[PDB]
Motif scaffolding. Structure first.
Motif, short mmCIF file in Angstrom:
data_model
loop_
_atom_site.label_atom_id
_atom_site.label_comp_id
_atom_site.label_asym_id
_atom_site.label_seq_id
_atom_site.Cartn_x
_atom_site.Cartn_y
_atom_site.Cartn_z
N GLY A 601 0.82 -1.20 0.00
CA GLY A 601 0.00 0.00 0.00
C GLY A 601 0.85 1.26 0.00
N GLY A 602 0.56 2.17 -0.91
CA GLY A 602 1.26 3.45 -0.91
C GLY A 602 2.49 3.55 -1.80
N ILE A 603 2.99 2.43 -2.31
CA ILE A 603 4.17 2.47 -3.17
C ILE A 603 4.04 3.54 -4.30
CG2 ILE A 603 3.33 0.71 -4.72
CD1 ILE A 603 7.03 1.37 -3.65
N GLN A 604 2.84 3.71 -4.82
CA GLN A 604 2.63 4.65 -5.89
C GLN A 604 2.91 6.09 -5.47
OE1 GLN A 604 0.04 3.19 -4.31
NE2 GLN A 604 -0.77 5.10 -3.41
N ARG A 605 3.10 6.33 -4.18
CA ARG A 605 3.32 7.71 -3.74
C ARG A 605 4.79 8.09 -3.82
NH1 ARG A 605 2.00 5.79 1.44
NH2 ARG A 605 3.77 5.73 2.89
N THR A 606 5.61 7.15 -4.29
CA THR A 606 7.05 7.37 -4.38
C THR A 606 7.52 7.53 -5.84
OG1 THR A 606 7.48 4.98 -4.35
CG2 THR A 606 7.48 6.15 -2.21
N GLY A 607 6.57 7.60 -6.76
CA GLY A 607 6.86 7.79 -8.17
C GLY A 607 7.55 6.55 -8.67
N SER A 608 6.97 5.41 -8.31
CA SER A 608 7.57 4.13 -8.60
C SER A 608 6.63 3.26 -9.38
CB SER A 608 7.94 3.40 -7.30
OG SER A 608 8.90 4.12 -6.57
N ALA A 609 7.18 2.53 -10.34
CA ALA A 609 6.46 1.46 -10.98
C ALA A 609 7.00 0.19 -10.37
CB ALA A 609 6.73 1.47 -12.50
N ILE A 610 6.23 -0.89 -10.50
CA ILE A 610 6.69 -2.21 -10.09
C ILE A 610 6.69 -3.17 -11.27
CG2 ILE A 610 6.07 -1.85 -7.69
CD1 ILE A 610 3.45 -3.15 -8.10
N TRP A 611 7.48 -4.23 -11.20
CA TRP A 611 7.37 -5.31 -12.20
C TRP A 611 7.39 -6.63 -11.48
CZ3 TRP A 611 12.24 -4.69 -10.61
CH2 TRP A 611 13.20 -5.68 -10.82
N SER A 612 7.00 -7.70 -12.17
CA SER A 612 6.70 -8.96 -11.51
C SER A 612 7.96 -9.76 -11.21
CB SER A 612 5.67 -9.78 -12.32
OG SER A 612 6.07 -9.92 -13.68
N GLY A 613 9.09 -9.25 -11.68
CA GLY A 613 10.38 -9.82 -11.37
C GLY A 613 10.84 -10.94 -12.30
N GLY A 631 -4.73 -7.69 -11.07
CA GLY A 631 -4.90 -7.63 -9.64
C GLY A 631 -4.10 -6.49 -9.03
N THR A 632 -2.95 -6.20 -9.63
CA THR A 632 -2.17 -5.06 -9.17
C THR A 632 -2.91 -3.75 -9.42
OG1 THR A 632 -0.13 -6.25 -9.69
CG2 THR A 632 0.04 -3.92 -9.16
N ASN A 633 -3.48 -3.60 -10.61
CA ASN A 633 -4.22 -2.38 -10.88
C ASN A 633 -5.47 -2.19 -10.03
OD1 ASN A 633 -3.45 -0.56 -13.56
ND2 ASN A 633 -2.38 -2.52 -13.34
N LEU A 634 -6.23 -3.26 -9.86
CA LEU A 634 -7.43 -3.22 -9.05
C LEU A 634 -7.10 -3.17 -7.56
CD1 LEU A 634 -10.01 -5.42 -10.98
CD2 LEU A 634 -10.35 -3.21 -9.89
N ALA A 635 -5.81 -3.19 -7.25
CA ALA A 635 -5.35 -3.00 -5.88
C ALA A 635 -5.05 -1.52 -5.60
CB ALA A 635 -4.13 -3.86 -5.63
N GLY A 636 -4.99 -0.72 -6.66
CA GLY A 636 -4.78 0.71 -6.53
C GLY A 636 -3.43 1.15 -7.07
N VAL A 637 -2.69 0.18 -7.61
CA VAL A 637 -1.34 0.43 -8.11
C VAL A 637 -1.25 0.18 -9.62
CG1 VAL A 637 1.07 -0.26 -7.92
CG2 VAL A 637 -0.31 -0.01 -5.88
N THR A 638 -1.26 1.25 -10.41
CA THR A 638 -1.46 1.08 -11.84
C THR A 638 -0.17 0.96 -12.66
OG1 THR A 638 -2.61 1.86 -13.84
CG2 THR A 638 -1.86 3.55 -12.32
N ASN A 639 0.85 1.76 -12.33
CA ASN A 639 2.10 1.73 -13.10
C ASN A 639 2.86 0.45 -12.82
OD1 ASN A 639 2.14 5.19 -12.55
ND2 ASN A 639 2.07 4.32 -14.61
N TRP A 640 2.57 -0.55 -13.65
CA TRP A 640 3.03 -1.91 -13.46
C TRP A 640 3.62 -2.44 -14.76
CZ3 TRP A 640 1.32 -6.42 -15.95
CH2 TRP A 640 1.77 -7.62 -15.39
N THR A 641 4.57 -3.37 -14.66
CA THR A 641 5.09 -4.00 -15.85
C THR A 641 5.72 -5.36 -15.56
OG1 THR A 641 6.56 -3.72 -17.77
CG2 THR A 641 7.30 -2.76 -15.66
N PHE A 642 6.24 -5.99 -16.62
CA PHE A 642 6.93 -7.26 -16.50
C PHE A 642 8.08 -7.34 -17.51
CE2 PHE A 642 2.97 -8.34 -19.03
CZ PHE A 642 3.59 -8.15 -20.27
N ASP A 643 8.78 -8.46 -17.56
CA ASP A 643 9.83 -8.64 -18.56
C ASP A 643 9.24 -9.23 -19.84
OD1 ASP A 643 11.91 -7.68 -16.95
OD2 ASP A 643 12.42 -9.65 -16.17
N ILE A 644 9.18 -8.45 -20.92
CA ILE A 644 8.76 -9.04 -22.19
C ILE A 644 9.72 -10.16 -22.57
CG2 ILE A 644 8.22 -8.75 -24.63
CD1 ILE A 644 7.93 -5.61 -23.79
#
Ligand SMILES: [Cl-]
Ligand SMILES: [Cl-]
Ligand SMILES: [Cl-]
Ligand SMILES: [Cl-]
Ligand code: NI
Ligand code: NI
Length: 944
Positions: A601-613, A631-644
């Motif tokens: 919770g709150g990670i998005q307040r640090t100007g951070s994206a996350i990825w699934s690792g 599930g990440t977006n519907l959790a309130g955290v939108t800037n998300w990605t993964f390794d193509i």
């Protein structure tokens, strides 16, 4: 015997007469948000300062308190909470008198078990229950790897891992969600931890002798056959030493990769209902049930995970179990849970491992967006990322020199393939100085120049920084002397994977004083060279890979906030917060960017994206990233990605008859087809997630290393990269929306089609912004896929213009070159010219494309893309409104203004009404042109 009521300025505090819960507090957090705190004590002060919530009780929100008989009502304009004065149970109804959320009991407190460290006298295992017999859908909860979108009726473990990110925000099919404000490991559904296979099942071997038959092979040769209850090689105790070692006979085959295994027997559940099964593994594993395959998985030896499925079993029946695990150096364990009590089968349950109280926030909202907004309100606005972050990112594990990075970036430019960002991964420092943040002089002689050459090519560069430090380094020493190093990893003599192996430790981010040094170290040594962004890897933390989760807990003890367990999920937030804060301190006008491999919770307040690792180049894994993002977006955290393409491919892909496989040209002939098709389909999927990013271990992952110029697959990859940039006006509008409208980019169908139940459960489609219905192809060699068109809207095939009606499941054309895409009738989609990087398209001319058959609304968000001026109101919207009955598009008066915004814009408008060969030919499409000056202008749709 009723509760005493104390009228606070933020709500009420009920003092309950009997039961373990002594006090119950309600706090009005906003118009739509009430905090609920059940306390087994009298001192609310014992409850910790939130890591997640930055929001304080509201002062400007009117609320009423009515009391009569056995109920006590506390209500706002938008929410009402009805508490019983008998037991303390709370009941939430909307502003119009409907039950949204009913508490069952007042909670279940009990001893903390899963904490290896001495426990606080006033800490307990938490558990709250809600809405028995509910038909509810459930969403959010964070990034998970078992394909769930609707979690109703199943379990989620909200732990923290390489592959898993817990965000305890739960959204309902109904008009509400809640934030479970606990920092420890939390469990949705079944409260229990999945036990070994043998704890709720009886086991029969190969003959039927009441554990399983475990055969050991070296190659194809049979070397031993005994029977074991719990076959378990899940963890290392120490370094590279298994917790349970392999038999004398084949202890060698494990290290050399010739060891292989089979399990065989039968399982008899003893209870009737739905059972959960979990196969935790590395290497190749196939579980077989009843002469039919249920699971087929593979992972790199050093990043195993759980693979799950639910079966409906009968208490007397025995079913045949066959497993085949070729460990290739990795781990294995089977877990399982038996059906819960009958009344708990269909209910909402949340439980944490340690805490001092049941603490959560009820969030009401007429739409899912409204509910994310309540989350954003509690845990902090999702701050703007720089515009270039929504451009294409090219990364590798790893570029080895300044030269290589600049060479690969130059290759994109030379090939006119768009790109904004390249990344420098780990190991640019002297080998024996991790944590020094120095640049090896052999490969990286001039960092400032490296950044300078990157910048001169109009790109940005990001760089890896861990929370990891060698005790030999000055930077370690500085941290250690303030008491901020987690030193138990050193006592345990755990060597990492570099060279002969180095001693190493992770800092403690739970003190602001600690994170201020951390930042000052990387500021002093890296920021001065001018890097654009921080890839804050390994923030679970993963101090030592593959130890038990208790050991992982033990390792962060003591930290500033107590035990390792009391905060097992929260590491990434205080950490990223420290970097964000220092950046603001240094450059108070540029946007920082962080990519980090864990959140809360709150990670998005640090100007951070996350990825699934570190996921694996497997189809099962690409499919699963869909629900992970959802599930990440519907959790309130939108800037998300993964390794193509996934972080780690199998060995067939890395090594061949031609040696180390860099370019695809060095692959074994038979392997090329799949590697190219996996990347083609993955790049397609990747261009439609919040951040578009290629990264991984060898083979190399630049488009021109995956296939040759001119081939179908190269062309398909370049195309979607190009499309990403054509779509930038649309995309970056989402980008602005994340902040200004508490927006969500990657959307589960329930957000936009909440009245459609069939849509709730879908785990392989989603909305990408308001217009696009994305449907990734996740099956090797598939040339079509089933695609459900949600009811209540018509849809256009984005590529052909054919208009279909919703309410149906079509078989959608999916040739290799194209991922099934459909536009929602009524969408207004702005595109720009072809650009090679985001700034090129600033103030650009627009094509406005209106998809007729319904009304439409889109406000184009524009700003400078780099600065903080947007926070003082420096941005603009160009409002687009479309009326299908009149066939008229109004391009409204421009709202706002920002520095370097053009007053005049060349804008052209077109209307798609059915098939057109120009459906994606943005430059040449027939369109009516407009010279827009910020003043409202109308464009009628063409006659008949
Ligand atoms: Cl340029
Ligand atoms: Cl350029
Ligand atoms: Cl250019
Ligand atoms: Cl340019
Ligand atoms: Ni520069
Ligand atoms: Ni340029």
């Amino acid at each position: 015997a009723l509760a005493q009521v104390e009228r606070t300025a933020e709500g009420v505090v009920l003092t309950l007469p009997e039961g373990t819960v002594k006090k119950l507090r309600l706090q009005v957090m906003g118009e739509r948000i009430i905090r609920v705190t059940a306390l087994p004590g009298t001192d609310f002060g014992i409850v910790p300062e939130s890591i997640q919530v930055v929001a304080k009780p509201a002062t400007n929100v009117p609320f009423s308190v009515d009391q009569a008989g056995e109920k006590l009502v506390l209500k706002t304009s938008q929410v009402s909470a009805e508490v019983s004065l008998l037991d303390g149970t709370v009941s939430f109804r909307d502003a119009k008198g409907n039950v949204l959320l009913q508490e069952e009991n007042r909670g279940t407190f009990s001893p903390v078990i899963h904490d290896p460290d001495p426990v606080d006298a006033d800490s307990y295992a938490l558990r709250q229950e809600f809405n028995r017999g509910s038909d509810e859908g459930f969403f959010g909860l964070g990034q998970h790897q078992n394909g769930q979108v609707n979690y109703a009726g199943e379990n989620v473990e909200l732990t923290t891992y390489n592959l898993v990110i817990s965000i305890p925000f739960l959204v309902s099919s109904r008009n509400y969600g809640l934030l479970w404000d606990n920092n420890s490991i939390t469990r949705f559904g079944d409260p229990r931890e999945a036990q070994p296979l043998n704890q709720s099942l009886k086991l029969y071997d190969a003959e039927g002798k009441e554990g399983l038959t475990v055969r050991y092979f070296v190659g194809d040769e049979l070397k031993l056959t005994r029977v074991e209850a719990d076959f378990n090689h899940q963890f290392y105790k120490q370094g590279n030493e298994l917790e349970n070692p392999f038999p004398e006979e084949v202890a060698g085959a494990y290290k050399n990769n010739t060891l292989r295994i089979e399990l065989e027997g039968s399982i008899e559940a003893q209870a009737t209902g739905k059972h959960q099964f979990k196969m935790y593994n590395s290497g190749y594993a196939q579980l077989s049930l009843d002469g039919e395959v249920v699971l087929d998985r593979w992972r790199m030896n050093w990043n195993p995970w759980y693979h799950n499925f639910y079966r409906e079993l009968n208490a007397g029946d025995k079913h045949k179990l066959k497993v085949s695990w070729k460990p290739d150096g990795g781990f294995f364990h089977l877990r399982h849970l038996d059906p819960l009590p009958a009344n708990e089968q269909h209910e909402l349950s949340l439980a944490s491992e340690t805490g001092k109280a049941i603490d959560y926030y009820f969030v009401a909202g007429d739409t899912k967006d409204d509910i994310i907004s309540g989350y954003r309100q509690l845990t902090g606005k999702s701050v703007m990322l720089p515009k270039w972050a929504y451009g294409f990112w090219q990364s590798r594990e790893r570029y080895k020199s300044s030269d290589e990075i600049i060479q690969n970036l130059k290759e994109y430019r030379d090939r006119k393939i768009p790109i904004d960002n390249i990344v420098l991964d780990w190991s640019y420092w002297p080998e024996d100085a991790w944590g020094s943040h120095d640049f090896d002089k052999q490969f990286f002689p001039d960092p400032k120049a490296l950044v300078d050459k990157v910048h001169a090519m109009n790109a940005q560069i990001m760089i890896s920084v861990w929370p990891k430090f060698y005790p030999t380094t000055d930077n370690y020493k500085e941290l250690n002397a303030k008491g901020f190093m987690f030193n138990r990893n050193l006592d345990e003599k755990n060597l990492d994977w570099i060279g002969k192996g180095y001693l190493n430790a992770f800092y403690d981010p739970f003190s602001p004083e600690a994170t201020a040094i951390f930042w000052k170290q990387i500021r002093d040594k890296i920021n001065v060279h001018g890097f654009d962004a921080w890839w804050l890897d390994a923030v679970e933390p993963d101090i030592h890979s593959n130890l038990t989760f208790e050991k992982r807990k033990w390792l962060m003890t003591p930290n500033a906030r107590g035990n390792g367990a009391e905060i097992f999920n929260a590491y990434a937030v205080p950490h990223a917060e420290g970097v964000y804060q220092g950046e603001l301190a240094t450059d108070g006008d540029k946007r920082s960017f962080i990519l980090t491999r864990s959140g809360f919770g709150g990670i998005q307040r640090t100007g951070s994206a996350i990825w699934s690792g570190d996921i694996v180049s497997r189809w099962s894994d690409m499919k699963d990233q869909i629900a992970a993002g959802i599930g990440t977006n519907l959790a309130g955290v939108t800037n998300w990605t993964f390794d193509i393409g996934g972080f780690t491919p199998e060995d067939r892909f890395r090594h061949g008859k031609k040696g180390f496989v860099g370019s695809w040209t060095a692959l074994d002939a038979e392997q090329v087809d799949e590697w190219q098709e996996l990347n083609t389909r993955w790049y397609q999927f990747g261009a439609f997630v919040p951040l578009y990013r290629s990264h991984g271990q060898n083979p190399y992952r630049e488009i021109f290393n995956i296939a040759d110029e001119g081939t179908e697959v190269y062309n398909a990859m370049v195309w979607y990269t190009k499309l990403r940039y054509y779509l930038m006006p649309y995309i970056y509008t989402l980008g602005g929306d994340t902040y200004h409208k508490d927006g969500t980019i990657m959307r589960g169908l329930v957000m936009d089609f909440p009245n459609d139940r069939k849509a709730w459960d879908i785990n392989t489609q989603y909305m990408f912004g308001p217009a696009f219905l994305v449907n990734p192809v996740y099956e090797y060699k598939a040339r079509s896929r089933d695609v459900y068109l949600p009811a209540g809207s018509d849809w256009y095939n984005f590529y052909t213009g054919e208009k279909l009606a919703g309410g149906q499941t079509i078989t959608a054309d999916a040739p290799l070159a194209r991922v099934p895409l459909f536009v929602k009738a009524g969408a207004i989609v702005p595109t720009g010219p072809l650009i090679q990087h985001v700034d090129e398209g600033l103030n650009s001319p627009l094509l406005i494309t209106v998809y007729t058959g319904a009304n439409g609304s889109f406000d184009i968000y524009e700003d400078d893309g780099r600065s903080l001026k947007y926070q003082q109101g420096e941005w603009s919207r160009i409002p687009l409104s479309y009326d299908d009955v009149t066939g008229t598009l109004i391009i409204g008066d421009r709202v706002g203004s920002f520095t370097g915004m053009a007053d005049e814009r060349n804008i052209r408008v077109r209307f798609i009404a059915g098939p057109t060969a120009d459906a994606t030919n943005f430059d040449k499409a027939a369109a009516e042109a407009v010279t827009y000056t910020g003043k409202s202008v109308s464009i009628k749709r063409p006659r008949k």
